[PDB]
UniProtKB/Swiss-Prot annotation:
This is WD repeat-containing protein 19. WD repeats lie at residues 11-51, 52-92, 95-134, 137-175, 273-311, 317-356. Some isoforms are tissue-specific. Highly expressed in the prostate. Lower expression in the cerebellum, pituitary gland, fetal lung, and pancreas. In normal prostate, expressed in both basal and luminal epithelial cells. No expression detected in fibromuscular stromal cells, endothelial cells, or infiltrating lymphocytes. Uniformed expression in prostate adenocarcinoma cells. The chain holds residues 1 to 366 of 1342 of the full protein. It comes from Homo sapiens (Human). Induction: By androgenic hormones. Expression increased 3-fold in an androgen-stimulated androgen-sensitive prostate adenocarcinoma cell line compared with androgen-deprived cells. It comes from the Eukaryota. It is found in: Cell projection, Cilium; Cytoplasm, Cytoskeleton, Cilium basal body; Cell projection, Cilium, Photoreceptor outer segment; Cell projection, Cilium, Flagellum. The gene is WDR19.
Length: 366
């Protein structure tokens, strides 16, 4: 495994950078820093597009197609819609004019959910280009959210309350939680009956220390999980397998827990991959492997054998402080951000093209 290219901008230096790969294609990568400019690069390492912003950028995300990317900025009520097919940037006005904080896409449909600190919510239908405003979704700052296979929008406010609704904006379930929700994700439970194929129950991280499960089927029995205080604060968690959660901590310890009935929160295997700190964890189904970055080192291990050590990389001292690890939908490219504003792209997977005439051979390296 070899790194393809490193992105280092002087403006990005000294400040964290947020990056997002195009979904299902990985052709475009949008990276932002503290310069109010979001740059979209190709897989070659060269710039493809640039977006100017009037305020600090928040985050990026991509739909199933990946053609439509919304660029967002703080202290602004306009969304910069960028079309990858023509690489053209236009401005969309929501008309609600609030402290916009959160941007997300529907994981199946072309629905764009936008939320503000004031709690106002808007749903944008790209197929019909229709705007549906829903007011009073939350009474405090919205943290994050998730979408299911049936286009159900889940949201969680800093007032410690979670709203689950449909794509039409009608509130379906309202639940109270002990701490501030973070990292909401939809997923499908696998019981003995395969007739249920809809993602219904939501896993969230409260206070970066506890795990909470809210079930739409049984809202009267929420599930709570608590981890050891020695591990620290929850950085990020990923879903893989038939209901398996891999949770990373600030002390370099990862916990794998199954979600089968009667075994929720039961640890599978835990180890101290990073001696001091773990920065991020990325799980790839196509690679079927997990890459954990921390202490300026990246360890990629097979998901089948978590104890097996596949790829070890020791980063340079100039990359002190890492950000997040993100994998393209095909698992071909893995990108890592740094707290100082430097990005790295690694060729984790690549199609196997090769031939041989006599003893001479040729093979696809990058």
């Amino acid at each position: 495994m070899k790194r393809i290219f490193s992105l280092l901008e002087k403006t990005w230096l000294g400040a964290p950078i947020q990056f997002a790969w195009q979904k299902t294609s990985g052709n475009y990568l949008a990276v932002t820093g503290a310069d109010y400019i979001v740059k979209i690069f190709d897989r070659h390492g060269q710039k493809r597009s640039e977006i100017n912003l009037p305020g600090n950028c928040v985050a990026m995300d991509w739909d199933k197609d990946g053609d439509v990317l919304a660029v967002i900025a703080e202290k602004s009520s306009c969304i910069y819609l960028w079309d990858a097919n023509t690489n053209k940037t236009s401005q969309l006005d929501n008309g609600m004019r609030d402290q916009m904080s959160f941007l997300l896409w529907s994981k199946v449909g072309s629905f764009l959910a936008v939320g503000t600190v004031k709690g106002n919510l808007l749903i944008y239908n790209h197929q019909t280009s229709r705007k549906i405003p829903v007011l009073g979704k939350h009474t405090k700052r919205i943290t994050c959210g998730c979408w299911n296979a049936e286009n159900l929008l889940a949201l969680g406010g800093e007032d410690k309350m979670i709203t689950v609704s449909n794509q039409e904006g009608d509130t379906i379930r309202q639940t109270q939680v002990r701490s501030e929700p973070s990292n909401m994700q939809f997923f499908l439970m696998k019981m003995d009956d395969r007739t249920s194929a809809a993602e219904s129950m939501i896993s969230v991280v409260l206070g970066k220390k506890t795990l909470f499960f809210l079930n739409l089927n049984e809202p009267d029995n929420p599930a709570d999980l608590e981890f050891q205080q020695d591990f620290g604060n929850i950085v990020c968690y990923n879903w893989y397998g038939d209901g398996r959660i891999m949770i990373g901590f600030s002390c370099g310890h990862f916990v794998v827990i199954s979600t089968h009935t009667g075994e929720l929160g039961q640890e599978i295997f835990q180890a101290r991959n990073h001696k001091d700190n773990l920065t991020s964890i990325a799980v790839s189904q196509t690679l079927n492997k997990v890459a954990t970055c921390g202490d300026n080192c990246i360890k990629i291990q097979d998901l089948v054998d978590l104890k097996d050590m596949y790829v070890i990389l020791n980063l340079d001292e100039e990359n002190k402080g890492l950000g997040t690890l993100s994998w393209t939908d095909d698992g071909q490219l893995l990108a890592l951000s740094t707290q100082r504003g430097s990005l790295h792209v690694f060729l984790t997977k690549l199609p196997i093209l090769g031939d041989a005439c006599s003893t001479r051979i040729a093979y696809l390296t990058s």
